[PDB]
Design a binder for this molecule. Structure first.
Ligand code: HEC
Ligand code: HEC
Lengths: 79, 78
């Protein structure tokens, strides 16, 4: 959805996925420029438990449907 | 893993993930420049069934552990 709203919500995400969506640790994925619909589905799937990862299930706990779309827009538009 | 061997096993993967690791389709992820260790984990997780996606489970059933490392290195280093 809204890239700017996503930025506002990305401070925690940046600690692991990087300030510009490129991670510095090899087990944390890069998000910069990823497909927006794919990113949204992953966040939806962590929240629902469809994709089991204890760290990310925890990170999406407080995210609304709009928040996940917005975070996806923020990373997808990274160049 | 061995990027060169990976590239040689990548024809099927390229059909959805793109010839240069950037996909054309909104629900298919880009793999280009992704972290090698992360990509390797996901492939192992599709094969073990720990990550559920009917399409990718299918795609990994034929791959050895080395093939999966090799594909990961191929995408990670492009
Ligand atoms: C570490 C403490 C993290 C923080 C903070 C955030 N994420 Fe994360 N993320 C982390 C790990 C270890 C993984 C991989 C899980 C695995 O299967 O090995 C991820 C993965 C994601 C993904 C999936 C990417 C993909 O290519 O499929 C996304 C979309 C993602 N993370 C986004 C994201 C957001 C929006 C965060 C804050 C709200 C966030 N992550 C925090 C580790 C960590
Ligand atoms: C479509 C018909 C595909 C073919 C052929 C291959 N993959 Fe795939 N891939 C596909 C989908 C629909 C998804 C997303 C599943 C989801 O969770 O929505 C994926 C995902 C991957 C991943 C995970 C990437 C991530 O960021 O976590 C990887 C590492 C991957 N695909 C690699 C890969 C390889 C090596 C392939 C052939 C051997 C391959 N894919 C084929 C769809 C399709």
């Amino acid at each position: 959805g809204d890239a700017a709203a996503g930025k506002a919500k990305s401070v925690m995400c940046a600690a692991c996925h990087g300030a510009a969506g490129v991670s510095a640790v090899p087990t944390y994925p890069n998000l910069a420029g990823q497909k927006e619909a794919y990113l949204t589905k992953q966040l939806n799937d962590f929240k629902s438990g469809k994709r089991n990862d204890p760290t990310m299930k925890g990170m999406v706990m407080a995210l609304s449907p709009a928040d996940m779309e917005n975070l996806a827009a923020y990373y997808a538009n990274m160049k």
